[PDB]
Symmetry: D3
Subunit: 256 residues, 6 copies
């Protein structure tokens, strides 16, 4: 497809070793999972996996980042409106819970997802149903829940904004991501992984010379694995077939 | 092997078309062939072919450029010395006529090959034999003769140095090469041919960007196809995997 | 996808060199471009490029050949009908200007596009808006315009049918295509380009022997690059894996 | 290398299944093996295997077909002459027993190998040594023996020519080859095996259309697997890249 | 796409040879074809072919297995409902005859397709039209008919359930499939065919060792080619990159 | 060829980074180089490189491990005997200094190379010549010297056995290898490097599952890179095409 994320649990480091260990624990289960760590540390891929090697791989998988949807529509996107009961609901659409009936569904920066919405959220993981936008009726739903916030919820609770009964039911399996800069053993490795995706995205393929590679083991990766993903995609279309490096990368990681 | 010459009769141009036409004429035959044209215009390859699609492909093929051998040894290299009859002949070696018995044998810049030697040469293509260094005996030899001089023999005759009975027996099939710079339709074409050899010579492979390619269609090629061959080999080891161009080639063909 | 056009600005010839030169001129710009030349001389590809290496590659690209659409619908296809204001408009569709908001949009044989329609056309490149089918309202539109007529407009003007103010605003960048038969240096080249597309279209791959290739450098190509494209596609499905040639091509280019 | 034999124990048929069964029996052993069957039924390959999956793969393997060597030299080729003790022995050469010390050594059409020579042969597999040409000395030799005659020895014994004590020591493990025409399940299979060798022998690769393949399942194969090997090699150089068939093969197997 | 069926008329055996012979007979024709044999013996592929090498390949191809659709909807799926004339017909859908106008349409286990429906069926292959769900109007239709029942119709007729005038018009070309277990020459062959599909379905590729292959030539294949297809797909995702066998397959075909 | 060593300066770790740094220092030079570190830590490859990116790549390279040659012959192997001046010198052979005239020559565990021999050694790097076995004559020699001892020479000096003037002239460029177990960042990396060699050594190719890989990052590598090289070669012939791991490796690195 067009996604921009890949095989990403490749790795030597003990860092990523133990995050794989984490994954073993919880992989038999239908119970909820919470992924914590900085953004762009490959959370989605961690989830996407849990799906496949679940008992429900044959079903669907819905990602929804609560970030990018505005606040007002957030309810219909998730639950669904029968045409008319929402001022300007022209379509009899389905929510993502409708959609994910069968497989699992993925939630991004839950710490973002508003106080009003997270209440209803509590229901459906206790209620076993939900009511569409403007409907007195409850609908049966088999769905496994995975969610990922970049933020700390222990402090989201004290501050109020997060309800301590959501949290109680989502921490059956904590998994804690490691930032890429704690994983530098593993740079090289997935860089291979990368051009092996991209080689079949665009005309061409690149290759990093050792010069720029060490240089990439230098950097911060505040944006982590996602940041790097963006970067490799750029050059793979920018100079295709070419070597890469030595200093053909952004003037930023010009590192000694 | 380690040779540095290739598939080289690739080509659109009428120039190389008619040199292929030439090849058709003479390809059924066991009779001698003379190839004329500048050096490094791929003569050898023209011969090497005539061999394969002869009736004798299953036999051998000996190249000898009269240039690079010194003058004194020229006779033993070609005819062979029984140990002792040459002051310091420690080995009972064979000549190239011994060697090429069966297949064919290739002679470079015949215009170079000394007056003394070319006399004996006349013999064996009339004599049907030759005598080794220091031997009263004649040896039966089945060999087809191909030869290539960069120089004009019509003027080698008037000036003396070439015997008009050699020439009479070698022009059963003239073939006249076209200099590469008369063949620029065909640059691109064999450039492909080239990295397809070299890709399996060294680690890597290159690729020319369109920038440098037009730039290569500019140049003289005084050294012709051979010159270009040397050039592609250089960069294929120099920067491997990389793009080539735009101006990574020698400061020479920096051409607008 | 299923298109049947490719990498096609491959080429040695000065012909295609200067048509690439043309492309350099106008590639920074948002201003209109007019491509002139015979049909099937690869015009679309010339446009498609200008898009990618524009500032708007990330947007869309809409091709519409005024030829194949009938005359009556031509307005709604381009501007769009709100259900009902067109006798039998059941759908609230969008036009191609709606569609191309963001990227650029491509027009074929403008010399065909009727007198009535080209008037409205003038508006939107001056008006900065357009009104849908049966709507009193104007809609803001950011779109760059490229168009290609096989016909001569200087004579389309004298004859009347083309308005001299369209033409004034479309000739900011003329580009003039070269017919394939003026580009025979370049046949071979893109023939490679071709089986390298098609090899991943169908089971198999072909290859042209030198016999049929020279034979293809013979031909007219009244249909030019498009004609050849059709031809290679045919055999690539007709005899797959096979050699091609010598006379397995249509009895037409049977050429000495 | 240049051999012309391959992976050839590929196969569905019960015929070749049981000849593989045979191979299992005897594969642990250092004791002699006799392979019986028509020529060109791939005997050598059957041996070559037994070597590799012996305990001595790390050693050498010498093939000698008693056929192609003349009768007089047969002794020195096998045992070796110290320069001078053979009228015209200029070289202090080694025999094949010298040579195969370590690995194993392969003998073809033993039924051919003369009465005089097979006597000495008996010695070394009992004697544990041999004496070079013109030497009073015996030399220690560790060698495993495999041999293959196209002919029946039970009748070679009655007729005299074969000694009943050779035979007694060589039938520790009989293996009996199946003629290719008893193995037609398996044609297709190794035909794949074939172009997968040859594809890396010469420029190109071929492919058989279904037409000619059934046609090849028709034929006798008096020459068996070897015959077919010769055949595939021919076309792989004859028409390269091309389809093969339908009737591009020799006018012989033109079969309905 | 996601189908799970392939190149499947690969084969040595006389069994599959004559089923290919069958295909030759009827391939010029627009007249109806009936395919008989057990399920999962690759019927669809036999049809899909007849399409391509028909005169109508450029058109569409609709498969409909009368099995999996319930009984009540069977009419609208095939003929199509204008919104409203069917209690709960919200959509103005098309039938498969609408759909297949142009190409051909495929019917599975006709022996299943109910008495009521097969009457109307008779009409359209005589009537040259059909009437949508709840419409007094007849619609012109150019469609070629192929159908496949696992069951015997001669006994479907005596028992009643099948009308002897359907049958009369469908047996212009009988083709009779051979069960896979009558085709064991051909196992190996298409197994190759298989990983060559699947290698481009999922990450990886497998390979069968000879151990498990003979073991697969053992089995029943009550499910025939389809059964095997399911099987190869399983392991290709189960253990990817790995060898397969020896006993990594289901405990079922554990065969001596 | 048949060597069993590869591309081996692949690596993330600071360990191997600084050993590459070392290499930069000394790469312009003709002066002697000493490589210290445990055996099997890839010393040869470190040298082999220095050659290529020297000014003398176009020349030869001779490896001689003083270990495996016995003590008595050590002089002729290095210097060369004219037939007769050594009791049983039948051949007029050349030494390795003869041989390496032009390129460079490599010496293994110099700490092994006997007191007698290392004296003469001193000469030639001061003398600029050497005398063959049994010759009053000195021969001019242009050779660059690289040598590698597993042992510590500072203590080889105190103990006597190593002469403090050898050492003075060999430490123009020290390079100090890092044991593989200090380089575990880099395991994975060169493991790739490995099957990419071996894939073209034997039929097949393997692949390590993540299971066994972490397990390989566990181990000691007393034998270091060489040890691992031996290991990968083993399985690449042992189980070919297969996965490797999880515990198909020797019962030794069975590591938790
Ligand atoms: N188009 C394409 N996209 C790719 C490829 N590799 C990774 N991706 C994308 O990036 C994610 C990487 O997943 P993973 O870590 O390999 O983790 C994968 C892998 O663990 C496994 N998996 C997924 N598909 C297959 C498959 O077809 N065969 C096998 N053997 N395993 C699979 O389940 C997870 C499912 O991942 P996804 O949900 O697909 O999510 C995948 C996929 O969506 C690829 O080769 N092609
Ligand atoms: N010389 C030549 N080769 C061709 C052509 N079309 C396809 N190929 C070859 O086919 C491979 C895959 O083509 P694909 O299936 O479209 O798969 C393509 C396609 O998925 C995508 N892609 C590459 N270039 C373009 C492009 O210009 N436009 C679009 N839309 N997609 C592209 O990337 C994939 C791989 O491209 P590559 O890495 O080049 O690898 C390409 C290239 O080897 C052609 O017109 N000329
Ligand atoms: N990563 C990795 N890949 C390896 C290694 N060894 C072989 N390969 C792969 O195998 C291909 C051919 O190896 P080859 O048979 O030796 O054939 C080689 C060999 O003939 C020659 N060659 C390349 N590099 C060297 C080198 O450093 N030394 C020598 N002596 N020959 C080389 O060029 C051919 C092709 O080299 P490539 O173009 O790279 O293509 C190589 C490369 O893809 C390795 O140690 N590491
Ligand atoms: N599926 C497929 N289709 C192909 C391929 N190559 C060409 N085509 C089709 O034919 C047109 C040829 O474009 P171009 O001359 O290569 O000119 C291309 C090329 O100049 C550049 N371009 C397009 N896509 C890519 C890409 O993915 N990577 C890079 N590096 N350049 C691209 O922009 C132009 C965009 O062309 P398009 O609009 O795609 O239009 C492309 C594409 O639509 C291919 O490999 N795969
Ligand atoms: N032996 C065998 N090999 C298979 C099979 N399926 C796929 N392959 C191999 O996979 C390559 C690409 O398959 P693909 O992804 O479908 O990509 C295919 C697909 O895009 C298209 N294609 C080829 N044949 C057909 C066909 O019969 N029907 C359809 N719908 N598409 C086809 O062309 C592409 C390349 O086909 P190829 O050139 O053959 O190259 C094929 C072929 O090497 C199979 O069933 N048997
Ligand atoms: N150059 C080349 N020649 C080939 C190839 N395949 C077969 N041949 C020639 O044909 C014979 C076929 O042997 P096999 O039946 O595969 O039987 C082979 C196979 O059973 C096994 N074997 C040999 N070499 C290797 C290897 O490198 N790796 C593995 N895994 N097995 C081997 O031992 C037997 C040894 O056969 P050979 O004595 O070599 O004799 C081989 C070989 O000499 C090939 O891929 N390349
Ligand atoms: N276009 C082009 N491609 C080249 C050239 N040289 C090598 N290749 C490519 O490299 C592959 C292997 O080359 P190789 O290592 O010499 O391995 C060669 C070589 O071993 C042998 N071979 C092929 N043609 C010839 C020839 O004309 N003369 C000789 N002596 N050997 C040949 O067959 C192998 C494979 O040939 P292919 O099947 O073509 O596969 C070739 C071809 O893909 C070239 O000059 N032009
Ligand atoms: N994606 C993909 N799918 C494949 C491939 N090979 C087979 N299939 C699927 O499995 C069926 C096998 O068809 P077939 O026996 O090869 O029989 C094929 C073959 O006989 C021929 N055919 C189909 N497409 C092509 C093509 O693109 N090129 C050529 N030369 N022949 C084709 O017509 C029949 C049409 O088959 P389909 O209706 O496509 O149905 C194909 C296709 O739907 C493949 O390589 N890629
Ligand atoms: N190391 C690495 N290699 C990659 C990656 N993405 C693509 N490749 C390489 O690209 C080939 C085809 O990728 P594709 O076009 O997506 O075509 C893929 C895709 O169609 C499908 N596929 C494989 N794995 C997955 C997966 O995890 N998820 C999904 N959705 N599809 C997959 O199977 C095809 C072939 O997969 P392969 O057999 O592996 O063959 C793959 C693999 O060689 C990656 O993230 N990492
Ligand atoms: N057959 C084969 N053998 C291989 C290959 N790669 C490595 N080896 C063996 O292992 C050594 C690894 O060298 P390196 O670290 O790549 O270091 C290499 C590399 O740095 C460079 N080099 C050597 N050959 C080539 C070449 O053909 N092209 C380029 N670009 N560089 C080369 O010089 C060094 C010379 O190494 P060697 O003396 O050859 O020693 C090489 C070579 O002998 C390969 O692909 N094929
Ligand atoms: N099915 C089949 N395929 C063949 C055969 N011969 C060659 N190939 C293919 O050709 C590739 C290289 O063959 P190669 O040039 O001999 O290069 C061979 C050769 O150098 C060596 N090799 C492999 N097997 C053997 C063997 O059994 N005996 C010997 N002596 N060498 C082998 O390893 C290289 C690569 O072998 P692969 O990894 O298999 O990769 C092989 C394999 O893909 C054959 O008889 N049957």
């Amino acid at each position: 497809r067009e996604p921009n994320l890949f095989r990403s649990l490749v790795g030597t480091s003990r860092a990523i070793q133990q995050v794989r260990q984490m994954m073993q624990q919880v992989a038999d289960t239908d119970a909820s999972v919470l992924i914590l760590g900085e953004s762009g540390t490959g959370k989605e891929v961690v989830a996407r996996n849990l799906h496949y090697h679940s008992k429900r791989r044959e079903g669907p998988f819905v990602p929804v980042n609560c970030g990018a949807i505005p606040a007002e529509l957030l309810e219909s996107e998730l639950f669904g409106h029968e045409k008319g009961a929402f001022t300007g609901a022209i379509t009899s659409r389905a929510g993502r819970f409708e959609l994910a009936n069968g497989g699992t569904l993925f939630l991004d920066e839950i710490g973002d997802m508003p106080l009003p919405m997270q209440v209803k959220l509590l229901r459906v993981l206790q209620e076993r149903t939900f009511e569409r936008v403007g409907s007195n009726k409850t609908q049966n739903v088999d769905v496994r829940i995975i969610a990922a916030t970049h933020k700390n919820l222990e402090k989201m609770i004290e501050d109020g904004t997060f309800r301590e009964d959501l949290y109680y039911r989502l921490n059956v399996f904590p998994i804690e991501m490691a930032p890429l800069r704690e994983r530098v053993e593993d740079i090289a490795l997935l860089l291979n992984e990368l051009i092996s995706r991209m080689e079949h995205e665009k005309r061409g393929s690149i290759r990093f010379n050792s010069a720029a590679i060490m240089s990439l083991c230098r950097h911060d990766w505040p944006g982590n694995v996602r940041e790097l993903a963006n970067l490799v995609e750029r050059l793979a279309i920018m100079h295709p077939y070419g070597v890469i490096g030595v200093g053909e990368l952004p003037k930023k990681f010009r590192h000694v």
